[PDB]
Structure formats: structure tokens, C-alpha cells
């Protein structure tokens, strides 16, 4: 069975150096024809190839990033490394470790992919969310919650209403900080009579808020 | 770079239906050795890409015979004879002959359902937000089909572009619809300089935009 | 340049 595990620092500041390690098994990079390389994918974006290193230390780099990139190996330890100097927020991505051979027998293709490692590049400090209850403007009613200006991810947002509700919680996005929103749609008889609470947890800032939506 | 152009980038289909995706390259992807390293990958959410097809037309392991590839030079196609539930995801073509190795932008193979108009809800800034000097207006546009929607923010009648952030969900697992949230963020002073706030959406389900609005003075 | 293939 062939395995590939990426490891990295998780969060990194702009201008500092990214160092990535791939640790593999079920094959050796001393096998002539064999190579290991790297592909990245920004959240919700396409795949971009970075570099490939061969059994004999020949490499290819993505030429648009060549001044930033250095690929290396340790065949004895079953490891391959990638260094990206002076990163910026656009270098935020899931980084995949991939095997590829240059002979038919050994598999000339991207068949084996690691599960990938998320690297976030940000100057932000740990910041607790501002949680804002969104009340309807003056047979089913829609309520909302706005979770604004937090770092790092994740936030968990759950609703406490009072029998048949539809929840839409939207993927976070950057504003050096994150913002998320969520809607709940309940029956008319449910509100205002009985309370409805937006529940937000941001573990990194020790944040656990239960926000009641107060009618207008 | 060798540009890999996929057509379309969003392909709705019914189950049982045929599908096909085009891939055209900037240059020939024939290697010096005479082979054509055109590959096709499928990526599902949370998971890494999986190999489907190598060297233009060859099915990889575990790939059912409903899948096929064809083409030569700069023009390629992947086909699925009958689409099944497991086939839904992001398909990428890929060239591996020239440096750098390049993927196309990705093609979302998505589900078809009956048209559904959005449910639109507008929310004024919270008392909480105003207290701390900020003013966001939020618009939820929920459970629509198809995914194409035109959202516009209007303040005192006129369109507003700056300070808008949008978030979209993936196709809903339960009802196959799409949802969208839009937030317009102003300073508190800017917010109190204006009275009429509108979230306006156009969707193929009507010829007239869905209009939701409030008046700051009436809150 | 082109990628390595035998």
C-alpha cells in the first residue's frame, strides 16, 4: 500500500519562509524512474503544480515561482521537502504531496496523492469574532447571524430555535480577518413568542456566545 | 504556460443523462517521445483529486466503462454515457508533457432540478454593530435554481459597488438548490447619511427583479 | 522545456 503524508507549519506570516515535508511509504525514491513532487490548491480554486524531484536529483520547477522555490529529497528517510521563500497571502492553500514516475511500469501519472496540508499565510493575530444578531425588518420568518472579524478559523455556528427550521450557514471569507453569516428560517408561530439564539464558538479566542435575536 | 481551456466550467445534468467536457490546449501536448500526456482527474469536496484517464483515452483503475476519453493534439473530450450519483464533482484536464504542468480551471458536474425562485431577506445593521461604529447590511438569497443570479445593492436608489462581500454555498445535498449571502459594509457615519437600503436580485424565474428594502428612519 | 518521460 502506497501512502504520502504532508506536514507544514499550519499558519505563517507574510515574508517568512514556508517549509514543507512529504513523508511517503510503499515505494522508494532510489528506484530509478521514480519521482515525487508538489501541487497546491487555494480554497475554492483550481490546482497549480509547483515542482517535481527525480530519483537522480533532476528537478522541474514552475518557472513563475522559481526564485522562491527549492525542492530536495532524503531517499534514505523516504522524505521530500519544499521551501518557498518570502510567502504572501496568495500562497495560502492546501499543499498536496504527489508521486509520479517517468516510466510506464512505475506509473507515469498522478495516481497517488496525499490528503494535503493546509497552510494559511496571514499577519493577523488571534481575534475574537464580533457576533451580531440579525432581526427581521419591522407563514415562515427568516432570522440571521453575522460573525465578523475573527482569526483564525474555525468558528462553529449553531442555532437554538423553538420544530421545523432550515439553516444556511455560509463559508467564511477574508476581510486579514474572517467573516461568516448564517440564516435560519422557522415557522411564523415560532417567533417572537419563544426565544431564538445564534450560538457561536471560536475556540482559539476562548469564545462561546449565545446571542438572542431581539424583535424590532 | 500551456493554457488548458475546459468547456463548460459548469455542467448541470440529470442522472442517466450523457455528459461531455471539452479541453483545448494552447499548444500541442504531444511529447518529444510521441506520447500525449493528457490526463483527467475527478475531485470531490474534502477529498484530493483522483486519476480517471491517462494518455488521452485510457481508463485508470476503478474507473467504470461509462467513462471515456478521446482527442488529439490540442483538442480533447471526456465523456460519460450515463451519469450516476458518484460522478458529481470537479473534473480537471491536465497536460504533463510541458513545464510547467498545467490543469484546466475545473468543471463542476452538477445536478439538474426544477427551477426555484430565491427567498430574499434583508437585514439592517444590528444594535450591537452600530454601538461599535460599524454598519453592515446583509442579504440572504436562499434555495434557488439554477445557480445564476444577479445581486445589486442600492442606497437611495443608486447602485453601490464598494464594501460588498459575497458568499455562496455548494449545491444543496437535500433539495439541489443554491444559496447566497451578501453583506454591504459601511462606516456608521456613512450609514446615517442615507435612508433607503435595497437588496435587488434578478434570476431566470422572473423578468422583474426581486426587491427587498428597508428605510433607516423606520427601524 | 518539457517534462521527463522515457
User: DSSP assignment of B133-170, as one string?
Assistant: TEEEEEEEEEEEBSS-EEEEEEETTEEE-TTEEEEEPP
- Taken in order of first residue, the domains within chain A and their CATH numbers are 1-123 (2.60.40.10), 124-215 (2.60.40.10)
Cα gap C1→B66, rounded to integer Å: 36
Cα gap B7→B20, rounded to integer Å: 9
Chain B: nearest CA to A15, how far in angstroms?
25
Q: Which element (helix H / strand E) includes B78?
A: strand B75-80
Q: In the PDB record, what is the listed experimental method?
A: X-ray
Q: How many CB pairs below 8 Å do chains A and C form together?
A: 14
Angle subtended at Cα B22 by Cα B19 and Cα B26, rounded to the nearest 5 degrees: 170
Angle subtended at Cα A100 by Cα A94 and Cα A103, rounded to the nearest 5 degrees: 170
Residue-wise burial string across A25-59, b where 16 or more C-beta atoms lie within 10 A, e elsewhere? eebebeeebbbbbbbbbeeeebbbbbbbbbbeeeb
**Strand pairing report for B178-187 and B58-59:** unpaired
Resolution in A: 2.1
Q: Is A163 on the interface with B (CB under 8 A)?
A: no
CB contact under 8 A, A60 and C1: yes
Chain A: nearest CA to B122, how far in angstroms?
7
Sign of the torsion angle spanned by Cα atoms A55, A58, A60, A66: positive
CB contact under 8 A, B98 and C5: no
Cα gap B29→B98, rounded to integer Å: 7
The C-alpha cell that represents B3 in the structure block: 493554457
Label each residue of A104-143 as H, E or C.
Answer: CCCCCCCCCECCCEEEEECCCCCECCEEEEECCCCCEEEE
Backbone dihedral region of B5: left (phi > 0), alpha (psi from -120 to 50 degrees) or beta? beta
CB contact under 8 A, C3 and B101: yes
**A124 exposure class (CB count in 10 Å sphere: 0-12, 13-18, 19+):** middle
Backbone dihedral angles phi then psi of residue B20, each to the nearest 5 degrees: -155, 145
The C-alpha cell that represents B57 in the structure block: 483515452
Taking alpha carbons only, the member of B159, B146, B164, B151 closest to residue B197 is B159
The answer to whether B116 and B144 are in contact (CB under 8 A) is yes
Q: Give counts: helices (H), strands (E), chain C.
A: 0, 0
Chain C: nearest CA to A123, how far in angstroms?
37
CB contact under 8 A, B126 and A116: no
Q: N- to C-terminal Cα distance for chain B? A: 55
Percent of residues in chain B assigned helix, strand, coil, to nearest 5: 5, 50, 40
Which residues from chain C sit within 8 angstroms of residue A35, using beta carbons? 4
Cα gap A131→A102, rounded to integer Å: 53
Any idea of the CA torsion for B184, B189, B195, B197, to the nearest 10 degrees? 0
- As a whole number of Å, the CA-based R_g of chain A is 23
Q: Which residues of A touch C (CB under 8 A)?
A: 33, 35, 52, 54, 58, 60, 102-104, 108
**A130 exposure class (CB count in 10 Å sphere: 0-12, 13-18, 19+):** buried
- Taken in order of first residue, the domains within chain B and their CATH numbers are 1-113 (2.60.40.10), 115-214 (2.60.40.10)
The answer to whether B1 and B100 are in contact (CB under 8 A) is yes
CB contact under 8 A, C3 and B35: no
Amino acid at each position: 500500500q502506497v501512502t504520502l503524508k504532508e506536514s507544514g507549519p499550519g499558519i505563517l506570516k507574510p515574508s517568512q519562509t514556508l517549509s514543507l515535508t512529504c513523508s511517503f511509504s510503499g515505494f522508494s525514491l532510489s528506484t530509478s524512474g521514480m519521482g515525487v513532487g508538489w501541487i497546491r490548491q487555494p480554497s475554492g480554486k483550481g490546482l497549480e503544480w509547483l515542482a517535481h524531484i527525480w530519483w537522480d536529483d533532476d528537478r522541474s520547477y514552475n518557472p513563475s515561482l522559481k526564485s522562491q522555490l527549492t525542492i530536495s529529497k532524503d531517499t534514505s528517510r523516504n522524505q521530500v521537502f519544499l521551501r518557498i521563500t518570502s510567502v504572501d497571502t496568495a500562497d495560502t492553500a492546501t499543499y498536496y504531496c504527489v508521486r509520479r514516475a517517468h516510466t510506464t511500469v512505475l506509473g507515469d501519472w498522478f495516481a497517488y496523492w496525499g490528503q494535503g496540508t493546509l497552510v494559511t499565510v496571514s499577519a493577523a493575530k488571534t481575534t475574537a469574532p464580533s457576533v451580531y444578531p440579525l432581526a427581521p425588518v419591522c407563514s415562515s420568518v427568516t432570522l440571521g447571524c453575522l460573525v465578523k472579524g475573527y482569526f483564525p478559523e474555525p468558528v462553529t455556528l449553531t442555532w437554538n430555535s423553538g420544530l421545523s427550521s432550515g439553516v444556511h450557514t455560509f463559508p467564511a471569507l477574508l476581510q486579514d480577518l474572517y467573516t461568516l453569516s448564517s440564516s435560519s428560517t422557522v415557522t411564523s408561530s415560532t417567533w417572537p413568542s419563544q426565544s431564538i439564539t445564534c450560538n457561536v464558538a471560536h475556540p482559539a479566542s476562548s469564545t462561546k456566545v449565545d446571542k438572542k435575536i431581539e424583535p424590532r | 504556460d500551456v493554457l488548458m481551456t475546459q468547456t463548460p466550467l459548469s455542467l448541470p445534468v440529470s442522472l442517466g443523462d450523457q455528459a461531455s467536457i471539452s479541453c483545448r490546449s494552447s499548444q500541442s501536448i504531444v511529447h518529444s517521445n510521441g506520447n500525449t500526456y493528457l490526463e483527467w482527474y475527478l475531485q470531490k469536496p474534502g477529498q484530493s483529486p483522483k486519476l480517471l484517464i491517462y494518455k488521452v483515452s485510457n481508463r485508470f483503475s476503478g474507473v467504470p466503462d461509462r467513462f471515456s476519453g478521446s482527442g488529439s493534439g490540442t483538442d480533447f473530450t471526456l465523456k460519460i454515457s450515463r451519469v450516476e450519483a458518484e460522478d458529481l464533482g470537479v473534473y480537471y484536464c491536465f497536460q504533463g508533457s510541458h513545464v510547467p504542468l498545467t490543469f484546466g480551471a475545473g468543471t463542476k458536474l452538477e445536478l439538474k432540478r426544477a427551477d426555484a425562485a430565491p427567498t430574499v431577506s434583508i437585514f439592517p445593521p444590528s444594535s450591537e454593530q452600530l454601538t461599535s461604529g460599524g454598519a453592515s447590511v446583509v442579504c440572504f438569497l436562499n434555495n434557488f435554481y439554477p445557480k445564476d443570479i444577479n445581486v445589486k445593492w442600492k442606497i437611495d436608489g443608486s447602485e453601490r459597488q464598494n464594501g460588498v462581500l459575497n458568499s455562496w454555498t455548494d449545491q444543496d445535498s437535500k433539495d439541489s438548490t443554491y444559496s447566497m449571502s451578501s453583506t454591504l459594509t459601511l462606516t456608521k457615519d456613512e450609514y446615517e447619511r442615507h435612508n433607503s437600503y435595497t437588496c435587488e436580485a434578478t434570476h431566470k424565474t422572473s423578468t422583474s427583479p426581486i426587491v427587498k428594502s428597508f428605510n433607516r428612519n423606520e427601524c | 522545456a518539457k517534462f521527463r518521460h522515457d
